[PDB]
Design a protein around this ligand. Structure first.
Ligand SMILES: CCCCCCCC/C=C\CCCCCCCC(=O)O[C@@H](COC(=O)CCCCCCCCCCCCCCC)COP(=O)([O-])OCC[N+](C)(C)C
Ligand SMILES: CCCCCCCC/C=C\CCCCCCCC(=O)O[C@@H](COC(=O)CCCCCCCCCCCCCCC)COP(=O)([O-])OCC[N+](C)(C)C
Ligand SMILES: CCCCCCCCCCCCCCCCCCCC(=O)O[C@H](COC(=O)CCCCCCCCCCCCCC)COP(=O)(O)OCCN
Ligand SMILES: CCCCCCCCCCCCCCCCCCCC(=O)O[C@H](COC(=O)CCCCCCCCCCCCCC)COP(=O)(O)OCCN
Ligand SMILES: CCCCCCCC/C=C/CCCCCCCC(=O)OC[C@H](CO)OC(=O)CCCCCCC/C=C/CCCCCCCC
Ligand SMILES: CCCCCCCC/C=C/CCCCCCCC(=O)OC[C@H](CO)OC(=O)CCCCCCC/C=C/CCCCCCCC
Ligand SMILES: CC(C)CCC[C@@H](C)[C@H]1CC[C@H]2[C@@H]3CC=C4C[C@@H](OC(=O)CCC(=O)O)CC[C@]4(C)[C@H]3CC[C@]12C
Ligand SMILES: CC(C)CCC[C@@H](C)[C@H]1CC[C@H]2[C@@H]3CC=C4C[C@@H](OC(=O)CCC(=O)O)CC[C@]4(C)[C@H]3CC[C@]12C
Ligand SMILES: [Zn+2]
Ligand SMILES: [Zn+2]
Lengths: 649, 649
């Protein structure tokens, strides 16, 4: 048998103490009145007695919402410590007011203050009561703060320090405590959500709590925006500076729900389709024809803007959608000429080392110069960190570097080589060959840059954003695959490097896995890596596991290494990657619409500014506002509070 | 510390004003009576005073369902603005009646009217009360309306215009406001749901709200159909014209739930199996034998219908299931003869240019003529837009165009060529070769047309419909893949076009990737696209990345471009496609049964009509009804209202 007994026994109350506690619990006003009146004369009764659960008379009265008994007890000088916290958590306005007018076990940590707990409960009435009487919440220090106080409190008590920080941020992130007591509720919500996300990053533990608080702040900002009832109010909100300055701040803080709000998107769309009042209600073929006509006239529109900016034809390209169409058309002609650079239209003799540029390359040159100039302008104005946050800008940097290297190598080969030596006799590192290879890589990057234009489309945009979001998990899995690849490459090279044979002995003087008869698949480490990479796609033939000497044990061990690699990468790793992509794609498709709308908002905003109006190659040739904003914010806060009371009930 | 203070302070009430408001909230009739009676004599009390939350005495009384206090306040001439809206939203019939008999903060936008809000709440009693007293809801203008009023209101206030439109459509889409006040609730639900879906398309923002309203209308129509209790009522509903006219209107408006309703499907099945009373209760082998017997007798049934339509054998094919079996059997014999056209049964000498048709082709000719005639009849009767909404009809158009081109090219080659020149010496664009290629493509399309017959099957039908629904997301992903393909094709062609070699230099006088030893994989852009497409399926060998001159840097850059393309398309893009297909297939399989039943209903309805009874090749040889419908609709509305009251409680 397992004996059962109260292992940690607590001192029980007297019969009269339990009578007093049962009296206050029951609600009999007269019984408690008599009990504490008698207690006053003697030392008989301890008015501050505790139930097993640690609740005294006052806490029991609060738990039953018994204002009369509470008033009596407070009149008879009951110990009141922590009673206000229980009243606030119970969310009884009457009890809170009664307590405001006037070491035991406690259900609240010692750092919890009345205003902090009220903010946690998010009760507008009680928070307003506690704020009307001047209260303060200590400022949480910066996340990466190395001051004496932070390190001292962390080393003395890390658990209590983290708990206090999280409680303070829960109090600040309360929508009610921001509706009150915050001068700019929208900006406060933005900055608080951003700071909470950064805390979630740094505080690896308690990550979920900070993420929840950040999401709470984002939702509060979006709901405040929801309460707008006219376009005047929405414009006042979005244009406030402490145009579209508030919207730009929202983009900076990644407030995706706020930006993708339907009315904000409607205003952005009206700004974006500036020249077309009825673009929303046009037919698909009409839209297609208008886009084609604007695109074909991009040289005309750009030249008109250059010659006379202040004219009917000149300022047509300043409209954001027209500007986008013109830039897209210019980039499309650039890609078309990149395609032409390979077709044999007035092509130079291929035996000329360091040839002069063709007409196609002479036409590509202004586009390349324009791209380089535009990218340096963008990184000069926006800064490096904002530039690198965009993977497309990183690809632009790589593409322009490759184009510049192509120009440099072409110039070097032109000034260094004069003759027409046959191409078969050129050195491996001939500058013309390297220039052509770099130009082809640049062509790949330039044509791949077109994917970023999917963001402007309603059908391809969400899909492109979802794939971009999947890329990071794909990259992590590729890292683990590369570790496996290095392992098997090391093993196979170690096994096979003895049997390396010269190219002369090979059937076509060809050594490697790129010959008609593959050979020396695992002779060198670099070639072994190439062989395993190509075996991923089944382009490596099995007979590469044989050697001339026909060492059957060595060949079988090599074939088994190759087969284990194939099972690991193609049967295990590839299907694990498929499963991860499925899970991540479900999670992404949950928020795909919001994410795509945020990306398309960024794309639209990039075309609102006057700078960069001309696409390549043509680009190388207060108090009243604050009062209005405060009035609108007051209306929004009132509507939000009413709506939250409606939803809570 | 972070100071906390009421940033946007509101003017607080007096002690006596707060006493009045607490009196009306408490419910003390005498206190409020005395308070406002005293207020009448002086200017002491403002009866229209506002709480912080913006609720006056009347709103507080409404919120507590206090009819006596409301009556008192209304008697003492309290300002009543917006009180009716709060009463309606609270959904208290007594308060609404009391208020009907008789700029502050408001929880409702200015455009909300009492009837509109009542429709939003969908409360049958309150809506009926407000409708009995004549009320109107402004007509929302057409979606693509360019009138002066629409553009003026949109440009003055777009947010308010969109809000008003959405509120009006929410009011109209109320099931209670359609049960009342709508002459044809089913047709009104159909048209309103269709219009709301179109609004969801056009109004890109607020898409979810319009989709929800459209789904609400569809559900209301389906529930009204659910309330039918006899086959007479169901037939009256489905046959009403303002046969199966109501069902045809439902098909037109894509009311899939209404069509796939069990009783409607049961009636359709009885109409469909006209000749077989017990087809539902027959065995699988009996069904198979009956289908085979009807199919083998299709020439007999068709000829009987031709010779004598009004006879026992003649009108057997008029039955929808018999007609379907006969058409399927005719198409199956057409496909069988298409197979025979390749088998060597009395085959013409292959060296004859422009030969006369074989017996197989002479038998195929009537089928092709019948298909062309049937398709032109279908597009003549139904119109082009209804024809193109069906992808199968588009494939039929392509197939018949290819067949007609085959006939034309055969005739041209017959009249132009007389000799028997050997086939090896024919020109590349010899009309006989083109005719044969077009005929083979037509054979592919004709045999693929059989997939559309899966809709008639209970097991293969849902699957085929699900795949068809997945095709569109597949197409979008193919678009992004084609962009990637063009990028890498541009790069690889740019790198490799210098090393293009003539066909004479190749081992078999064969140039391209279709030789035994592949070569010139990336010499031209077209060939580069072909090479990358075939490398998708692993049919491109690695040695095509080599060149004669063995420029090791160029060959390595080409192999790396090829490998990056392989990783992007096969490891990244293909698995992204798999993930998208999984997600879309889950979403589709949620509604697969309804979708398949709608498709099979369309298939069945296509065989109900007398026109097109004969398959190829044989096809080339009021007030009383309205009263009954209104009676049935009255019964359905009563049953639906009772059922909704039952479900709400
Ligand atoms: C910031 C973005 C980074 C990417 C773009 C930056 C430009 C990078 C371009 C750099 C090329 C610059 C010219 C170098 C060669 C000059 C001539 C020469 O001496 O050849 C020498 C070898 O030459 C080589 O090895 C060149 C290899 C270049 C590979 C670049 C691939 C970039 C792919 C990116 C995807 C001869 O050596 P030797 O004396 O015979 O011994
Ligand atoms: C609406 C549905 C669209 C599809 C069906 C419509 C029918 C389309 C059929 C059209 C063919 C009509 C005959 C054209 C050739 C006539 C003879 C001739 O001059 O040959 C010339 C070349 O000829 C060609 O290039 C023919 C190429 C036809 C490819 C059709 C593939 C359709 C695939 C669909 C999947 C000789 O040229 P030359 O003088 O040597 O220089
Ligand atoms: C040694 C010989 C070399 C031979 C030639 C090699 C050829 C290489 C071919 C290019 C390889 C990279 C291909 C990237 C294609 C673009 C990706 C499209 C999908 C996508 O949405 O990604 C977005 C941008 O990614 C990106 O743009 C990623 C760019 C990364 C920098 C490229 C440097 C190379 C996410 O972008 P976002 O929405 O997160 O912002
Ligand atoms: C230049 C040399 C050419 C060489 C020969 C080329 C051979 C091409 C072979 C045919 C390619 C198209 C194959 C389509 C097969 C039918 C699709 C079955 C799956 C399916 O349910 O799709 C339904 C109809 O699709 C469809 O019927 C799609 C038809 C699209 C038009 C076909 C024009 C070609 C959806 O139909 P739904 O239920 O949405 O209505
Ligand atoms: C991260 C790493 C996780 C990977 C853990 C899994 C390791 C499994 C290693 C398993 C790796 C097995 C490799 C076997 C192999 O290399 O075969 C060929 C060799 C040389 O010619 O000779 C044989 O030896 C002959 C027996 C073949 C026995 C095959 C049975 C193994 C089943 C493999 C899965 C195929 C399933 C496809 C469906
Ligand atoms: C939309 C675009 C999104 C795509 C973004 C991803 C790009 C990855 C590019 C990654 C593309 C890598 C291409 C590498 C390659 O072409 O290999 C062969 C070449 C020429 O012979 O020589 C080497 O260079 C030898 C090192 C091989 C190193 C392979 C490690 C890369 C891992 C690839 C994944 C295989 C995983 C299978 C499981
Ligand atoms: C698929 C193969 C043949 C390569 C084709 C390359 C280009 C001709 C395609 C690829 C991506 C396409 C772009 C994808 C995105 C858009 C957005 C599109 O705008 C919309 O979809 C909605 C209207 C709006 O932009 O406001 C305008 C066309 C454009 C630039 C497309 C123009 C044609 C592009 C450049
Ligand atoms: C699989 C290979 C051998 C190709 C076979 C081609 C045809 C012989 C098959 C392919 C699709 C089949 C059709 C798929 C759909 C149906 C529906 C089927 O009807 C039912 O399933 C339920 C009964 C009903 O139709 O009411 C009648 C047979 C039929 C025409 C099938 C007849 C035989 C078909 C034409
Ligand atoms: Zn600090
Ligand atoms: Zn209008």
């Amino acid at each position: 048998r397992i004996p059962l007994q109260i292992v940690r026994a607590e001192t029980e109350l007297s019969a009269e103490e339990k009578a007093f506690l049962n009296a206050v619990e029951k609600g009999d006003y007269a019984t408690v009145k008599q009990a504490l009146q008698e207690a006053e004369i003697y030392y008989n009764v301890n008015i501050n007695c505790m139930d097993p659960l640690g609740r005294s008379a006052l806490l029991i009265a609060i738990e039953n919402e018994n204002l009369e008994i509470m008033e009596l007890l407070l009149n008879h000088s009951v110990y009141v410590g922590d009673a206000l916290l229980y009243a606030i958590r119970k969310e009884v306005v009457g009890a809170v007011e009664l307590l405001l007018s006037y070491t035991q076990f406690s259900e609240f940590t010692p750092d919890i203050t009345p205003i902090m707990l009220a903010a946690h409960t998010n009760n507008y009435e009680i928070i307003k009561l506690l704020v009307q009487k001047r209260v303060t919440i200590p400022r949480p220090h910066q996340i990466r703060c190395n001051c004496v106080e932070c390190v001292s409190s962390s080393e003395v008590d890390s658990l209590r320090h983290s708990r206090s920080r999280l409680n303070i941020y829960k109090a600040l992130a309360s929508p009610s405590l921001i509706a009150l007591s915050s001068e700019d509720p929208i900006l406060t919500a933005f900055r608080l959500g951003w700071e909470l996300k950064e805390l979630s990053k740094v505080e690896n533990e308690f990550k979920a709590e900070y993420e929840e608080l950040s999401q709470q702040c984002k939702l509060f900002a979006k709901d405040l925006l929801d309460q707008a009832r006219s376009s005047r109010e929405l414009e006042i909100i979005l244009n406030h500076r402490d145009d579209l300055a508030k919207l730009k701040v929202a983009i900076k803080y990644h407030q995706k729900e706020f930006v993708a709000q339907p009315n904000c998107q409607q205003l952005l769309a009206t700004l974006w389709y500036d020249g077309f009042p009825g673009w929303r209600r046009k037919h698909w073929v009409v839209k297609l024809l208008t886009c084609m006509t604007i695109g074909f006239l991009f040289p005309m529109l750009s030249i008109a803007y250059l010659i006379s900016p202040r004219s009917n034809l000149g300022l047509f390209i300043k409209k954001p959608f027209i500007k986008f169409i013109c830039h897209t058309a210019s980039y499309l002609t650039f890609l078309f000429m990149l395609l032409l650079a390979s077709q044999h239209i007035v092509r130079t003799d291929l035996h000329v080392q360091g040839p002069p540029p063709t007409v196609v390359e002479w036409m590509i040159l202004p586009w390349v110069l324009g791209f380089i100039w535009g990218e340096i302008k963008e990184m000069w104005d926006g800064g490096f960190t904002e530039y690198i946050h965009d993977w497309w800008n990183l690809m632009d940097f790589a593409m322009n570097s490759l184009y510049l290297a192509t120009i440099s190598l072409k110039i070097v080969a032109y000034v260094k080589y004069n003759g027409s030596r046959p191409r078969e006799e050129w050195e491996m590192w001939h500058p013309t060959l390297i220039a052509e290879a770099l130009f082809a890589i640049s062509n790949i990057l330039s044509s791949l840059r077109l994917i970023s234009l999917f963001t402007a489309n309603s059908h391809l945009g969400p899909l492109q954003i979802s794939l971009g979001r999947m890329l990071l998990d794909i990259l992590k899995f590729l890292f683990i695959y590369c570790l496996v690849l290095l392992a098997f490459a090391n093993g196979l090279n170690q096994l096979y490097f003895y049997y390396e044979t010269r190219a002369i002995d090979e059937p076509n003087n060809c050594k490697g896995i790129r010959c008609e008869k593959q050979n020396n698949a695992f002779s060198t480490l670099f070639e072994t890596l190439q062989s395993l990479f190509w075996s991923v796609f089944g382009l490596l033939n099995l007979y590469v596991t044989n050697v001339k000497a026909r060492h059957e044990f060595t060949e079988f061990v090599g074939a088994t290494m190759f087969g284990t690699y194939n099972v690991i990468s193609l049967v295990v790793l590839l299907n694990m990657l498929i499963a991860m992509m499925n899970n991540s794609y479900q999670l992404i498709a949950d928020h795909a619409d919001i994410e795509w709308k945020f990306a398309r908002t960024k794309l639209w905003m990039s075309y609102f500014d006057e700078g960069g109006t001309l696409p390549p190659p043509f680009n190388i040739i207060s108090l009243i506002q604050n009062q209005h904003y405060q009035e609108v914010i007051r209306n929004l806060v009132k509507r939000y509070v009413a709506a939250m009371i409606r939803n809570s009930k």
